[PDB]
């Protein structure tokens, strides 16, 4: 799928409440913080005798992910998230069909 | 597994009962623009009836 790097769409910002130019970016999952409560609880439970104490997921089936667009408002830097359908080939701002 | 022989007999045991019909239905399911209008019209109608009763 081809998505233009810039689109004019409604901006839900407090100061905009209208259509504004948005830079489109693919949402990437950030690093996993070791200080998160789930990580802290997991570490304490995993420490000590008893083996592995939480399910480990081996049965991966889907080969594609839903792509999420993060829209940077040019005016007020407001960011909005849009999710599209699953696509094997994804690209941002490519050449137009001719 | 699966058959439909007894289900119709089981259905009519206590009849195919219709839902109760009430005089007024909910103004839900209606157009929001229409629904809010009818509030204002009904509010004025209530006021008009009360004033007419008071003055008569």
């Amino acid at each position: 799928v081809n998505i233009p790097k810039t689109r004019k769409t409604y901006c839900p910002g407090k100061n905009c409440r209208k259509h504004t130019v948005h830079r489109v970016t693919q949402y990437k999952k950030g690093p996993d913080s070791k200080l998160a409560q789930g990580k802290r609880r997991y570490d304490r439970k995993q420490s000590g005798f008893g083996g592995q104490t939480k399910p480990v997921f081996h049965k991966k089936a889907k080969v594609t992910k839903k792509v999420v667009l993060r829209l940077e408002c040019v005016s007020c830097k407001y960011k909005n998230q849009l999710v599209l359908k699953r696509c094997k080939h994804f690209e941002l701002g490519g050449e137009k069909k001719t | 597994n699966h058959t439909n022989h007894n289900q119709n007999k089981k259905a009519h045991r206590n009849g195919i009962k219709r839902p109760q019909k009430h005089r007024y239905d909910s103004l839900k399911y209606r157009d929001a623009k229409f629904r809010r209008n009818q509030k204002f019209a009904n509010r004025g109608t209530v006021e008009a009836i009360r004033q007419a009763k008071a003055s008569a």
């Binding site: - | 259905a11 195919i16 219709r18 839902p19």
Partner: protein, 159 residues
């Protein structure tokens, strides 16, 4: 095994009539539907927007909501051992007035009329429809209509 799509097994139901394909008649959009009106649902295959389910094709119901280009129709659907109210938003392309309700309204107008002249004349008026009565006694004349005697025909070989 089945496939349970919304338009499954609708090949002949949603098909346009023979030599009735093409542009939809314009009179459909010029009819006004009000709440309480009786309407017959008949899905038009040309307009794929606002289509009701294939259950509601051929069903008759009462309009409860009127929208910009659509109509809200109240249908009672059999679900197990009860009737459920089903509120279908169907575009006016798939909706037509029920001639039964018209005919009832004209009969109501006639009955009120007959009642008016009955009271004016001081007589009582018969307003309730009656099932077809048994045939009355009547004479049948044989003048120039002499009965012809018939006998069953013998068997013949005609393929």
């Amino acid at each position: 095994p089945h496939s349970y799509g919304i338009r499954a097994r609708t090949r002949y139901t949603f098909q346009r009539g023979f030599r009735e394909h093409g542009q939809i008649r314009l009179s459909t959009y010029l009819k006004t539907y009000k709440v309480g009106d009786i309407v017959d649902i008949k899905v038009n295959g040309a307009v794929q927007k606002g289509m009701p389910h294939k259950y509601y094709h051929g069903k008759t119901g009462v309009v409860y909501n009127v929208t910009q280009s659509s109509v809200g129709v109240l249908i009672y659907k059999v679900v197990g051992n009860r009737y459920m109210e089903k509120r279908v938003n169907v575009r006016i392309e798939h909706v037509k007035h029920s001639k039964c309700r018209q005919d009832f309204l004209d009969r109501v107008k006639a009955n009120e009329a007959k009642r008016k002249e009955a009271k004016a004349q001081g007589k009582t008026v018969q307003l309730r429809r009656q099932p077809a009565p048994p045939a009355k006694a009547h004479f049948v004349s044989t003048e120039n209509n002499e009965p012809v005697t018939l006998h069953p025909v013998a068997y013949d070989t005609t393929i």
